[PDB]
Amino acid sequence: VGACVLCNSQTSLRCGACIRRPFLCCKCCYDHVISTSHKLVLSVNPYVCNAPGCDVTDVTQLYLGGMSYYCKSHKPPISFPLCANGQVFGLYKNTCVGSDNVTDFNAIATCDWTNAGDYILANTCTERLKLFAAETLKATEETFKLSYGIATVREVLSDRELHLSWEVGKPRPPLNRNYVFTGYRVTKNSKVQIGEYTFEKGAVVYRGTTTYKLNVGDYFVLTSHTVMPLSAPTLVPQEHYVRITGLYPTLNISDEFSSNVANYQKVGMQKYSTLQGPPGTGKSHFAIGLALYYPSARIVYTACSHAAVDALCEKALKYLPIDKCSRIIPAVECFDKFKVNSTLEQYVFCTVNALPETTADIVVFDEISMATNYDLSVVNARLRAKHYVYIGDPAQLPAPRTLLTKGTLEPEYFNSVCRLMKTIGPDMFLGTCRRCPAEIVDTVSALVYDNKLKAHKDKSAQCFKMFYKGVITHDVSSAINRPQIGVVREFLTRNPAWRKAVFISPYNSQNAVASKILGLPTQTVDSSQGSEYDYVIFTQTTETAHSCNVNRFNVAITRAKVGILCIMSDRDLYDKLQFTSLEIP
Ligand SMILES: CCS(=O)(=O)Nc1ccccc1F
Ligand SMILES: CCS(=O)(=O)Nc1ccccc1F
Ligand SMILES: [Zn+2]
Ligand SMILES: [Zn+2]
Ligand SMILES: [Zn+2]
C-alpha cells in the first residue's frame, strides 16, 4: 500500500515492470499498463496466474477467481478481470483521481537515459516525477555497472602496474577516474574487500585507495549500491521574509568578510538562496564567513564529494573554533582534524550520502553544479533547516551522466538548483575573480557569465593560444593528439619556465601520453575543477562535443593563476580566447 506518484491517490498497486515499482492508483496503474509494454502489476501480491506452470503475467489477460489470480485458460467459472473499467483492481478503488496526461510518467518509466531529452524531462516534469525520475535514473545507472565484466589480476608486472584478464561475453568499463573499482581476495568460501581502485592504460596503471602486495586471482568490480526511495522534494517551498529570521547577525565583523554582509542578510531573509560563485570568486570564504556573521547559528556544511566537504573543513580550520566542528564519516581517507561523527556539534561537515537525520539554523550545500536531484532530495529528507544556501556555478561541470550519449546536457538541466539559477538567475553572485589573469577572466566573462565577471588581477601577458588540429588517434574509450603534445614539447624547449606548468586535456589517454613525453603533472579538466595552478598547458586534443563543452572549457582555463597555453582544435573557442596568438614552428 502507498501513494500514486501521479495522483497521490491512496493505492495497493505498484507497476512491477518499472525498476522502482512506483505505487499507481487503479486509474493511473491502468492508463500506465495500456499505453506502455509495462504489464506486470504488484499489490499485496503479484497479479500473476497462480495456476500450476502457467506463464501469464500480463494484467490485461488475468482475472480474480476466488482470492487467487488466473488467466483466461485457468480461471474458475466465477471471476472478474483484474483490469477493466479504465482501472486496475486492488484496495482503495473508490478513492482514485487519475491524470489528464500520463505521458511524462511513461517516458520516465520507459526511457533508457541515453538521450538528453530524458534528463530534460526529469528536470521539467512535476516535482513528484522529478523524484521518481531521479530514483529510476540512479537505479538504471547502478544496474548498468553490473553489465560490466569482472577484471582479474592475471600477472603483477611491477608495483603500480598490472596485467588484467576480462570476463567473456560482457563489456569492459572505460579505464578513467569516473570508474572506481573494488578489488577482492579469493577466500575459503567467499571474498573480502581490499580497497577501492582506478585504472589507466599501460598492461594497466592502477591508483588504489590503499597500498597492498595484491597478487594473481584478485579481481575488480565497480561496486554498485542499493538506491533508497525518495520522499523530500528537490527544493522546499520558497519563502521570502521581511526581517532576518532565526539568525542573530554579529555586531563586529572583519574586513575579510565585509563584502558578503549584504548577501549574508539575504540568506536570512529567504528560506533558500542560490550563490553563483565563478572560479576563484570566494565560495568557501563565503560559506565559512556566514558562520562568523551568524556566530550562534548551527550550520551543517554538505557537498556530494569528500573533497568538497574537506575543502570547506580546511577553510573552517582557518576561521572557526575546532572544538565547535565535527566531520561525519561513515564506518576513503578524508579530513581528520575535527572530532569524528559528532552530530550535535555546532558546525557539521558531511557528504550528502552520509548525512544524519538532524535540524540546523543553516544548511550550506556546496559545489551545487555536481549535485543531482537525487542528492537535492536526500538533503531535504535528512536536514530540516531554517535556511538553505546552495553555492556553486552552473557554468562549471555537472556530475557525469554515465548513460548519456545522444544530446548535450545544458546547465539548466543539471539539477533543480541550477534550473533556478539559469532561468530566474541566482539570488547572489560573486563577481570578482581573484585567481586568474585578466585575459582569462575577460574570456569566461563573455563566454559564460554575461560580462558580469570582473578581474582582480591585471593582464599577465602570459596567456597564449595556438590553432593546431594535428592528428587524433582513438583508443578503446579516449583520444590522443601526439602532434599537440609535440607542439607543447617544442614550446617548453623555447620557454623552459613553463616546466612548472600542469598539463590539462579533456582526455585521460592524451594525459597519459603527455606525462611520458613532457613529465608535467596532468589533470583531466574534470579532475582539475576546484584546483588552481600558476601555469596551465591545455591541449584540446579533438573538436568533439566533449572537448568543446563551454562549461568544461570554462573550468580548463580558469585553473591558471598566472599563465596558460591553449593548443586548440576548435576554431570557435580559439576565436573566443582573448589571448596572444602564436604561429606553429
Ligand atoms: C466492484 C466489483 S468489480 O467491479 O467486479 N471489480 C472491478 C475490477 C476492476 C476494475 C473495476 C472493478 F469494479
Ligand atoms: C546517517 C548514517 S551514516 O551514513 O552512517 N553517517 C553518519 C551519520 C551520523 C553519525 C555517524 C555516521 F556515520
Ligand atoms: Zn511501469
Ligand atoms: Zn493515480
Ligand atoms: Zn494461466
Coordinates of C-alpha atoms and ligand atoms in Angstrom, one line a residue:
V1 CA 0.0 0.0 0.0
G2 CA 1.2 3.6 -0.8
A3 CA 0.7 6.8 -2.9
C4 CA 0.0 7.1 -6.6
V5 CA 3.1 9.1 -7.8
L6 CA 0.8 10.9 -10.3
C7 CA -2.4 11.5 -8.1
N8 CA -1.2 10.7 -4.6
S9 CA -4.5 8.7 -4.5
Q10 CA -4.1 6.0 -1.8
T11 CA -3.4 2.7 -3.6
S12 CA -2.5 -1.1 -3.3
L13 CA -0.9 -1.3 -6.8
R14 CA 2.8 -0.9 -7.9
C15 CA 3.9 -1.4 -11.6
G16 CA 6.1 -4.5 -11.5
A17 CA 7.8 -3.8 -14.9
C18 CA 9.1 -0.3 -13.6
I19 CA 12.5 -0.8 -12.0
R20 CA 11.4 1.4 -9.0
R21 CA 7.9 -0.3 -8.6
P22 CA 6.1 3.0 -8.1
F23 CA 2.6 2.9 -6.4
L24 CA 0.0 3.6 -9.1
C25 CA -3.8 4.2 -8.4
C26 CA -6.3 2.0 -10.2
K27 CA -6.7 4.8 -12.7
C28 CA -3.0 5.7 -13.1
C29 CA -1.9 2.0 -13.0
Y30 CA -4.4 1.3 -15.9
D31 CA -3.5 4.4 -18.0
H32 CA 0.1 3.2 -17.5
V33 CA -0.3 -0.6 -18.4
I34 CA -2.4 0.0 -21.6
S35 CA -0.1 2.8 -23.1
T36 CA 3.3 1.0 -22.5
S37 CA 4.9 -2.5 -22.5
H38 CA 4.7 -2.5 -18.7
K39 CA 2.0 -5.2 -17.9
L40 CA 3.3 -6.9 -14.6
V41 CA 1.3 -5.4 -11.7
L42 CA 2.2 -5.9 -7.9
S43 CA -0.3 -5.4 -5.0
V44 CA -0.2 -7.1 -1.5
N45 CA 0.5 -10.0 -4.0
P46 CA 1.8 -10.0 -7.7
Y47 CA -1.0 -10.0 -10.4
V48 CA 0.3 -13.3 -12.0
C49 CA -1.7 -16.5 -12.8
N50 CA -1.5 -18.8 -9.6
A51 CA -2.2 -21.8 -11.9
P52 CA 0.4 -24.6 -11.8
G53 CA 3.1 -24.0 -14.5
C54 CA 1.4 -21.1 -16.4
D55 CA 3.5 -18.1 -17.6
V56 CA 0.7 -15.3 -17.7
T57 CA 1.9 -12.1 -16.0
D58 CA 0.0 -9.5 -18.3
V59 CA -2.6 -7.9 -16.0
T60 CA -4.9 -7.2 -19.2
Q61 CA -5.0 -11.1 -19.6
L62 CA -5.8 -12.0 -16.0
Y63 CA -8.9 -12.4 -13.6
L64 CA -9.6 -12.6 -9.8
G65 CA -11.3 -16.0 -9.4
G66 CA -11.6 -17.0 -5.7
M67 CA -8.9 -15.0 -3.8
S68 CA -6.3 -16.1 -6.5
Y69 CA -5.4 -14.6 -9.9
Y70 CA -5.9 -16.6 -13.2
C71 CA -5.5 -16.1 -17.0
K72 CA -8.4 -16.9 -19.4
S73 CA -7.3 -20.6 -19.7
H74 CA -7.2 -21.4 -15.9
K75 CA -9.8 -19.1 -14.4
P76 CA -12.7 -20.5 -12.4
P77 CA -16.4 -20.1 -13.6
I78 CA -16.8 -17.1 -11.2
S79 CA -14.1 -14.4 -11.8
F80 CA -13.9 -10.7 -12.8
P81 CA -11.0 -9.4 -15.0
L82 CA -8.3 -7.6 -12.9
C83 CA -8.0 -4.8 -15.5
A84 CA -11.4 -3.3 -16.7
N85 CA -13.5 0.0 -16.3
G86 CA -10.4 2.2 -17.2
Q87 CA -9.0 0.9 -13.8
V88 CA -6.8 -2.0 -12.5
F89 CA -8.2 -3.9 -9.5
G90 CA -6.9 -3.5 -5.9
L91 CA -7.7 -1.8 -2.5
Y92 CA -9.0 1.9 -2.3
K93 CA -10.7 1.6 -5.8
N94 CA -13.4 4.3 -4.7
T95 CA -10.6 6.9 -3.8
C96 CA -8.8 7.5 -7.1
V97 CA -8.5 10.8 -9.2
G98 CA -6.2 9.9 -12.2
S99 CA -4.5 12.5 -14.6
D100 CA -5.3 14.2 -18.0
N101 CA -1.9 13.1 -19.5
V102 CA 0.3 10.2 -18.0
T103 CA 2.7 10.8 -21.0
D104 CA 5.6 12.2 -18.8
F105 CA 5.5 9.3 -16.2
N106 CA 5.5 6.7 -19.1
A107 CA 8.5 8.4 -20.8
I108 CA 10.4 8.4 -17.4
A109 CA 9.4 4.8 -16.7
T110 CA 10.4 3.5 -20.2
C111 CA 13.4 5.7 -21.3
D112 CA 17.0 4.2 -21.2
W113 CA 18.6 7.6 -20.1
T114 CA 20.9 7.7 -23.3
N115 CA 19.1 10.8 -24.8
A116 CA 19.5 14.4 -23.3
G117 CA 15.7 14.8 -23.6
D118 CA 15.4 12.1 -20.9
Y119 CA 17.3 14.3 -18.3
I120 CA 15.4 17.5 -19.5
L121 CA 12.1 15.8 -18.7
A122 CA 13.3 14.5 -15.3
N123 CA 14.1 18.2 -14.6
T124 CA 10.9 20.0 -16.0
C125 CA 8.3 17.3 -15.0
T126 CA 6.2 17.8 -11.8
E127 CA 8.2 17.6 -8.5
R128 CA 6.8 14.1 -7.5
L129 CA 8.0 12.9 -11.0
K130 CA 11.5 14.6 -10.5
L131 CA 11.9 12.2 -7.5
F132 CA 10.5 9.1 -9.4
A133 CA 12.9 10.0 -12.4
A134 CA 15.8 10.6 -10.0
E135 CA 15.4 7.1 -8.4
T136 CA 14.6 5.4 -11.8
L137 CA 17.8 7.1 -13.3
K138 CA 20.1 6.2 -10.4
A139 CA 18.8 2.6 -10.2
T140 CA 19.4 2.3 -14.0
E141 CA 22.9 3.8 -13.5
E142 CA 23.8 1.3 -10.7
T143 CA 22.4 -1.7 -12.8
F144 CA 24.5 -0.6 -15.8
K145 CA 27.6 -1.2 -13.6
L146 CA 26.6 -4.9 -13.3
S147 CA 26.6 -5.2 -17.1
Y148 CA 30.4 -4.7 -16.9
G149 CA 32.8 -7.8 -17.0
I150 CA 34.9 -8.7 -13.9
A151 CA 38.6 -7.7 -14.4
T152 CA 41.0 -10.3 -12.8
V153 CA 44.8 -9.9 -12.0
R154 CA 46.5 -12.4 -14.4
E155 CA 50.1 -11.0 -13.8
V156 CA 51.6 -8.4 -11.4
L157 CA 54.2 -6.9 -13.9
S158 CA 55.5 -4.5 -11.2
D159 CA 54.1 -2.2 -8.4
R160 CA 51.5 0.4 -9.6
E161 CA 51.2 -1.7 -12.9
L162 CA 49.1 -4.9 -13.6
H163 CA 48.0 -7.3 -16.4
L164 CA 44.2 -7.9 -16.3
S165 CA 42.1 -10.8 -17.7
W166 CA 38.5 -9.8 -18.6
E167 CA 35.2 -11.8 -18.2
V168 CA 34.0 -13.1 -21.6
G169 CA 30.6 -12.0 -23.2
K170 CA 30.4 -8.8 -21.1
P171 CA 31.7 -5.2 -21.9
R172 CA 34.7 -3.8 -20.1
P173 CA 34.2 -0.3 -18.4
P174 CA 36.2 2.7 -19.6
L175 CA 39.6 2.9 -17.7
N176 CA 39.4 6.6 -16.4
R177 CA 38.8 8.0 -12.9
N178 CA 35.0 8.3 -13.4
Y179 CA 35.1 4.4 -13.0
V180 CA 36.2 3.4 -9.4
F181 CA 36.7 -0.4 -9.0
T182 CA 36.7 -2.5 -5.8
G183 CA 39.3 -5.3 -5.5
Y184 CA 38.6 -8.6 -3.7
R185 CA 40.8 -11.6 -2.4
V186 CA 39.8 -15.2 -3.2
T187 CA 38.9 -16.9 0.2
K188 CA 37.9 -20.4 1.5
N189 CA 34.1 -20.0 0.7
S190 CA 33.7 -16.2 -0.1
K191 CA 35.5 -12.9 -0.9
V192 CA 36.6 -9.8 1.2
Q193 CA 37.1 -6.1 0.0
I194 CA 40.7 -4.9 -0.4
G195 CA 40.1 -1.1 -1.0
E196 CA 38.6 0.9 -4.0
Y197 CA 40.8 1.4 -7.1
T198 CA 41.1 3.1 -10.5
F199 CA 43.0 2.1 -13.7
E200 CA 44.6 3.7 -16.8
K201 CA 46.1 2.0 -20.0
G202 CA 49.8 1.0 -19.8
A203 CA 49.0 -3.8 -19.1
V204 CA 47.2 -1.2 -16.9
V205 CA 48.3 1.5 -14.4
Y206 CA 46.3 1.3 -11.0
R207 CA 46.0 4.1 -8.4
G208 CA 44.3 2.3 -5.4
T209 CA 42.6 3.8 -2.2
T210 CA 45.1 1.7 -0.1
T211 CA 48.6 0.1 -0.8
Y212 CA 48.9 -3.8 -0.8
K213 CA 51.0 -6.7 -2.2
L214 CA 48.0 -7.7 -4.4
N215 CA 48.6 -11.0 -6.3
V216 CA 47.0 -13.1 -9.2
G217 CA 43.4 -14.2 -8.8
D218 CA 42.5 -10.8 -7.1
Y219 CA 39.6 -9.3 -9.2
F220 CA 37.7 -6.0 -9.5
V221 CA 34.1 -4.8 -9.9
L222 CA 32.6 -1.3 -9.9
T223 CA 30.8 -1.5 -6.5
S224 CA 27.1 -0.5 -7.0
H225 CA 24.8 0.3 -4.0
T226 CA 21.0 0.0 -3.2
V227 CA 19.2 3.2 -4.2
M228 CA 16.7 4.2 -1.5
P229 CA 13.2 5.6 -2.4
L230 CA 13.0 9.5 -2.3
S231 CA 10.4 11.3 -0.1
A232 CA 11.5 15.0 0.2
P233 CA 11.3 17.5 -2.8
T234 CA 14.5 18.7 -4.6
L235 CA 13.7 22.3 -3.3
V236 CA 11.5 23.1 -0.3
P237 CA 8.8 25.7 -1.0
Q238 CA 10.5 29.1 -1.2
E239 CA 9.6 31.8 1.5
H240 CA 10.6 35.5 1.5
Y241 CA 10.8 37.2 4.9
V242 CA 10.8 41.0 5.7
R243 CA 13.4 40.6 8.6
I244 CA 16.3 38.1 9.0
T245 CA 14.7 35.0 10.7
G246 CA 16.1 32.7 13.4
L247 CA 19.6 34.1 12.9
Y248 CA 21.3 36.9 15.0
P249 CA 24.0 38.8 13.0
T250 CA 27.3 39.8 14.7
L251 CA 27.9 43.4 15.7
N252 CA 31.7 43.2 14.9
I253 CA 32.8 41.6 11.5
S254 CA 36.3 41.6 10.0
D255 CA 37.1 43.4 6.7
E256 CA 37.9 39.9 5.3
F257 CA 34.1 39.1 5.1
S258 CA 32.6 42.7 4.9
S259 CA 32.0 42.3 1.1
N260 CA 29.5 39.4 1.9
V261 CA 27.4 41.2 4.7
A262 CA 24.6 42.2 2.2
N263 CA 24.5 38.6 0.9
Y264 CA 24.6 37.0 4.4
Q265 CA 21.5 39.2 5.2
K266 CA 19.7 38.0 2.0
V267 CA 20.5 34.4 3.2
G268 CA 18.5 35.3 6.4
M269 CA 15.5 36.9 4.6
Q270 CA 14.6 33.8 2.4
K271 CA 14.1 30.1 3.0
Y272 CA 16.7 29.1 0.4
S273 CA 19.2 31.2 -1.6
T274 CA 21.4 30.4 -4.5
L275 CA 25.0 31.8 -4.7
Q276 CA 26.7 31.6 -8.2
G277 CA 30.5 31.6 -7.4
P278 CA 32.6 31.7 -10.6
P279 CA 36.2 30.4 -10.4
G280 CA 38.3 32.0 -7.5
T281 CA 35.5 34.4 -6.5
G282 CA 35.5 33.1 -2.9
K283 CA 32.8 30.4 -2.4
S284 CA 34.3 28.7 0.7
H285 CA 35.3 32.1 2.1
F286 CA 31.6 33.0 1.7
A287 CA 30.4 29.7 3.3
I288 CA 32.7 30.0 6.4
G289 CA 32.1 33.8 6.7
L290 CA 28.3 33.0 7.2
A291 CA 29.3 31.2 10.4
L292 CA 31.1 34.3 11.7
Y293 CA 28.3 36.6 10.5
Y294 CA 25.7 34.4 12.4
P295 CA 28.0 33.2 15.3
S296 CA 25.4 31.3 17.4
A297 CA 23.9 29.6 14.3
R298 CA 24.1 25.7 13.9
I299 CA 25.5 25.2 10.3
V300 CA 25.7 21.8 8.5
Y301 CA 28.2 22.1 5.6
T302 CA 27.4 19.4 3.0
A303 CA 28.5 18.5 -0.6
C304 CA 28.5 15.4 -2.8
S305 CA 32.3 14.8 -2.7
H306 CA 34.6 14.1 0.3
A307 CA 37.0 16.6 -1.5
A308 CA 34.3 19.4 -1.5
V309 CA 33.5 18.8 2.2
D310 CA 37.2 18.6 3.1
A311 CA 37.9 21.9 1.3
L312 CA 35.1 23.5 3.5
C313 CA 36.8 21.9 6.6
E314 CA 40.2 23.3 5.5
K315 CA 38.7 26.8 5.4
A316 CA 36.8 26.2 8.6
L317 CA 40.1 25.1 10.3
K318 CA 41.4 28.7 9.5
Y319 CA 38.5 30.7 11.0
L320 CA 36.1 28.6 13.3
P321 CA 36.8 27.1 16.7
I322 CA 38.0 23.5 16.1
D323 CA 36.1 22.4 19.4
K324 CA 32.8 23.5 17.6
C325 CA 33.5 21.5 14.3
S326 CA 32.8 17.8 13.6
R327 CA 33.5 15.7 10.4
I328 CA 30.8 13.0 9.7
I329 CA 32.5 9.8 8.2
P330 CA 30.5 6.5 7.8
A331 CA 32.2 3.3 9.1
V332 CA 38.5 6.6 1.6
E333 CA 40.8 9.0 3.6
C334 CA 39.2 12.4 4.3
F335 CA 39.8 15.4 6.7
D336 CA 40.8 14.1 10.2
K337 CA 41.3 17.3 12.3
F338 CA 37.8 17.6 13.8
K339 CA 36.2 15.2 16.3
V340 CA 34.6 12.4 14.0
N341 CA 30.8 11.7 13.9
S342 CA 29.6 14.3 16.5
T343 CA 26.1 15.2 15.0
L344 CA 25.3 17.6 17.9
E345 CA 28.4 19.8 17.2
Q346 CA 27.7 23.4 16.1
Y347 CA 29.4 23.0 12.7
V348 CA 28.8 19.7 10.9
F349 CA 30.8 18.8 7.7
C350 CA 29.5 15.8 5.9
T351 CA 28.9 14.4 2.4
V352 CA 25.2 14.2 1.2
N353 CA 25.1 10.3 1.3
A354 CA 26.4 10.2 4.9
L355 CA 24.1 12.9 6.4
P356 CA 22.4 12.2 9.8
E357 CA 18.7 13.0 10.4
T358 CA 19.0 16.3 12.2
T359 CA 17.9 20.0 12.1
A360 CA 20.1 23.2 11.8
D361 CA 19.9 27.0 11.6
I362 CA 21.7 27.0 8.2
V363 CA 22.5 24.2 5.6
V364 CA 25.2 25.2 3.1
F365 CA 25.2 22.7 0.1
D366 CA 28.5 23.4 -1.8
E367 CA 29.6 22.6 -5.4
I368 CA 25.9 22.5 -6.4
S369 CA 26.6 22.0 -10.2
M370 CA 27.9 18.5 -9.3
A371 CA 24.7 17.6 -7.4
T372 CA 21.8 15.5 -8.9
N373 CA 18.1 15.8 -8.0
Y374 CA 18.7 12.6 -6.0
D375 CA 21.2 14.5 -3.8
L376 CA 18.9 17.5 -3.5
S377 CA 16.0 15.4 -2.3
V378 CA 18.3 13.4 0.2
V379 CA 19.4 16.7 1.8
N380 CA 15.8 18.0 2.2
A381 CA 14.9 14.5 3.7
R382 CA 17.9 14.3 6.2
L383 CA 18.1 18.1 7.1
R384 CA 15.2 20.3 8.3
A385 CA 16.7 23.8 8.5
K386 CA 15.6 27.5 8.9
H387 CA 17.7 28.4 5.8
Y388 CA 19.3 26.5 2.8
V389 CA 22.2 28.1 0.9
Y390 CA 23.2 26.4 -2.4
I391 CA 26.7 27.5 -3.5
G392 CA 28.2 26.5 -6.9
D393 CA 28.4 27.7 -10.5
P394 CA 26.2 26.3 -13.3
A395 CA 29.0 27.3 -15.7
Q396 CA 31.2 24.6 -14.2
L397 CA 30.9 20.8 -14.5
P398 CA 27.9 18.6 -13.6
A399 CA 28.1 15.1 -12.2
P400 CA 28.9 12.7 -15.1
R401 CA 25.8 11.1 -16.7
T402 CA 27.4 7.6 -17.4
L403 CA 24.4 6.6 -19.7
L404 CA 24.1 9.8 -21.8
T405 CA 25.3 9.6 -25.4
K406 CA 22.7 11.4 -27.6
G407 CA 22.4 15.2 -27.0
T408 CA 24.4 17.6 -24.6
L409 CA 23.0 18.4 -21.0
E410 CA 22.6 22.2 -20.7
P411 CA 23.3 23.7 -17.2
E412 CA 19.5 24.5 -16.7
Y413 CA 19.1 20.6 -16.6
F414 CA 21.9 19.6 -14.1
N415 CA 19.5 19.9 -11.1
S416 CA 16.5 21.9 -9.7
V417 CA 19.0 24.4 -8.2
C418 CA 20.9 25.1 -11.5
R419 CA 17.5 25.3 -13.2
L420 CA 16.5 28.3 -10.9
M421 CA 20.0 29.9 -11.5
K422 CA 19.8 29.7 -15.3
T423 CA 16.0 30.7 -15.6
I424 CA 15.3 33.4 -12.8
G425 CA 19.1 34.0 -12.1
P426 CA 20.9 33.4 -8.9
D427 CA 20.0 35.1 -5.6
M428 CA 23.7 36.1 -5.1
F429 CA 26.7 36.5 -7.4
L430 CA 30.5 36.6 -6.5
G431 CA 31.5 38.9 -9.4
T432 CA 35.3 39.4 -8.8
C433 CA 37.8 36.6 -9.8
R434 CA 40.9 36.8 -7.6
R435 CA 42.8 33.9 -9.2
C436 CA 43.1 34.4 -13.0
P437 CA 45.0 36.8 -15.2
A438 CA 42.5 39.3 -16.8
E439 CA 42.8 37.8 -20.3
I440 CA 41.2 34.5 -18.9
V441 CA 38.6 36.5 -16.8
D442 CA 37.6 38.6 -19.9
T443 CA 37.3 35.3 -21.9
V444 CA 35.0 33.4 -19.5
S445 CA 33.0 36.6 -18.5
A446 CA 32.0 36.9 -22.2
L447 CA 31.9 33.1 -22.7
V448 CA 29.5 32.0 -19.8
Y449 CA 28.9 34.9 -17.2
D450 CA 27.2 37.6 -19.5
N451 CA 30.2 40.0 -19.0
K452 CA 29.4 40.2 -15.2
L453 CA 32.7 38.6 -14.0
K454 CA 35.4 41.3 -13.2
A455 CA 39.2 40.7 -12.9
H456 CA 41.0 41.4 -9.6
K457 CA 44.5 40.8 -11.3
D458 CA 45.7 42.7 -14.4
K459 CA 46.7 41.0 -17.7
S460 CA 49.6 38.6 -17.1
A461 CA 50.7 38.8 -20.8
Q462 CA 51.4 35.1 -20.2
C463 CA 48.1 33.8 -21.9
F464 CA 48.8 32.2 -25.3
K465 CA 46.7 30.3 -27.9
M466 CA 47.8 28.1 -30.9
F467 CA 45.4 26.8 -33.6
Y468 CA 46.7 23.2 -34.3
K469 CA 44.4 20.3 -35.3
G470 CA 47.3 17.9 -35.6
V471 CA 46.4 14.2 -35.7
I472 CA 43.8 12.5 -33.4
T473 CA 44.1 8.8 -32.6
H474 CA 41.4 6.9 -30.8
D475 CA 41.9 4.0 -28.3
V476 CA 39.2 2.0 -26.6
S477 CA 37.4 5.0 -24.8
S478 CA 39.7 8.1 -25.1
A479 CA 41.5 10.4 -27.6
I480 CA 45.2 11.2 -28.2
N481 CA 46.8 14.1 -30.2
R482 CA 50.6 13.4 -30.2
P483 CA 51.3 16.4 -32.6
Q484 CA 49.6 18.7 -30.0
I485 CA 51.9 17.2 -27.3
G486 CA 54.8 17.7 -29.8
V487 CA 53.9 21.4 -30.1
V488 CA 54.0 21.7 -26.3
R489 CA 57.4 19.8 -26.1
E490 CA 58.8 22.3 -28.7
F491 CA 57.1 25.3 -26.8
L492 CA 58.8 24.1 -23.5
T493 CA 62.3 23.9 -25.1
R494 CA 61.9 27.6 -26.2
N495 CA 60.1 28.6 -22.8
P496 CA 61.6 26.4 -20.0
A497 CA 60.0 28.5 -17.2
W498 CA 56.7 26.7 -18.2
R499 CA 58.2 23.4 -16.9
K500 CA 56.4 24.3 -13.6
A501 CA 53.1 24.0 -15.6
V502 CA 50.2 21.5 -15.0
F503 CA 49.1 19.6 -18.2
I504 CA 45.3 19.6 -18.7
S505 CA 43.3 17.9 -21.5
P506 CA 39.8 16.7 -21.9
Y507 CA 41.0 13.0 -22.2
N508 CA 42.9 10.7 -19.8
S509 CA 44.8 9.0 -22.7
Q510 CA 46.1 12.3 -24.0
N511 CA 47.2 13.0 -20.4
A512 CA 49.0 9.5 -20.1
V513 CA 50.9 10.3 -23.3
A514 CA 51.7 13.9 -22.3
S515 CA 53.1 12.6 -18.8
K516 CA 55.6 10.3 -20.5
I517 CA 56.7 12.9 -23.2
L518 CA 56.6 16.1 -21.1
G519 CA 56.7 14.9 -17.4
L520 CA 54.4 17.7 -16.4
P521 CA 51.8 16.8 -13.7
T522 CA 48.5 16.1 -15.6
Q523 CA 44.7 16.5 -14.7
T524 CA 41.6 15.9 -16.8
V525 CA 39.5 19.2 -16.9
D526 CA 37.0 17.2 -14.8
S527 CA 39.7 16.2 -12.1
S528 CA 41.0 19.8 -12.1
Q529 CA 37.7 21.5 -11.1
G530 CA 38.3 23.2 -7.6
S531 CA 42.2 23.3 -8.0
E532 CA 44.4 26.2 -9.2
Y533 CA 48.0 26.3 -10.6
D534 CA 50.3 29.2 -11.6
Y535 CA 50.8 27.8 -15.1
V536 CA 48.4 25.5 -17.1
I537 CA 49.2 24.0 -20.5
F538 CA 45.9 22.8 -22.2
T539 CA 45.6 20.6 -25.4
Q540 CA 42.0 20.5 -26.6
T541 CA 43.0 17.2 -28.4
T542 CA 39.8 16.9 -30.5
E543 CA 36.8 19.2 -31.7
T544 CA 34.2 16.8 -30.2
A545 CA 31.1 17.9 -28.2
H546 CA 33.1 16.7 -25.1
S547 CA 36.2 18.8 -25.9
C548 CA 34.1 22.0 -26.9
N549 CA 31.6 21.9 -24.0
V550 CA 31.7 25.6 -22.9
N551 CA 31.4 24.5 -19.2
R552 CA 34.5 22.2 -19.5
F553 CA 36.5 24.9 -21.3
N554 CA 35.5 27.4 -18.6
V555 CA 36.9 25.0 -15.9
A556 CA 40.0 24.2 -18.0
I557 CA 41.3 27.8 -18.5
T558 CA 40.3 29.2 -15.0
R559 CA 42.7 26.8 -13.3
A560 CA 45.6 29.3 -14.1
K561 CA 46.8 31.9 -11.5
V562 CA 49.5 33.5 -13.9
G563 CA 49.8 32.0 -17.4
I564 CA 48.1 29.4 -19.8
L565 CA 49.0 27.9 -23.2
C566 CA 45.9 26.6 -25.0
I567 CA 46.6 24.4 -28.1
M568 CA 43.1 24.5 -29.7
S569 CA 41.4 22.2 -32.2
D570 CA 38.1 24.1 -32.4
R571 CA 38.2 27.4 -34.5
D572 CA 35.1 28.6 -32.5
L573 CA 36.6 28.5 -28.9
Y574 CA 40.1 29.5 -30.3
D575 CA 38.5 32.7 -31.7
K576 CA 36.8 33.4 -28.2
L577 CA 40.2 33.1 -26.4
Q578 CA 41.2 36.7 -25.7
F579 CA 44.9 35.5 -25.6
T580 CA 48.1 36.2 -27.6
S581 CA 48.1 34.0 -30.8
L582 CA 51.3 32.1 -31.6
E583 CA 52.3 30.7 -35.1
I584 CA 53.3 27.0 -35.5
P585 CA 57.1 26.2 -35.6
Ligands
LIG1 C1 -17.0 -3.9 -7.9 C2 -16.6 -5.4 -8.2 S1 -15.9 -5.4 -9.9 O1 -16.4 -4.2 -10.5 O2 -16.2 -6.7 -10.5 N1 -14.3 -5.3 -9.8 C3 -13.5 -4.4 -10.6 C4 -12.3 -4.8 -11.1 C5 -11.6 -3.9 -11.9 C6 -12.0 -2.6 -12.1 C7 -13.2 -2.2 -11.5 C8 -13.9 -3.1 -10.8 F1 -15.1 -2.6 -10.2
LIG2 C1 23.4 8.5 8.5 C2 24.1 7.3 8.8 S1 25.8 7.3 8.1 O1 25.6 7.3 6.7 O2 26.5 6.2 8.6 N1 26.5 8.7 8.6 C3 26.6 9.0 9.9 C4 25.8 10.0 10.5 C5 25.9 10.3 11.8 C6 26.8 9.7 12.6 C7 27.7 8.8 12.1 C8 27.6 8.5 10.8 F1 28.5 7.6 10.3
ZN3 ZN 5.8 0.6 -15.2
ZN4 ZN -3.1 7.7 -9.6
ZN5 ZN -2.8 -19.3 -16.6

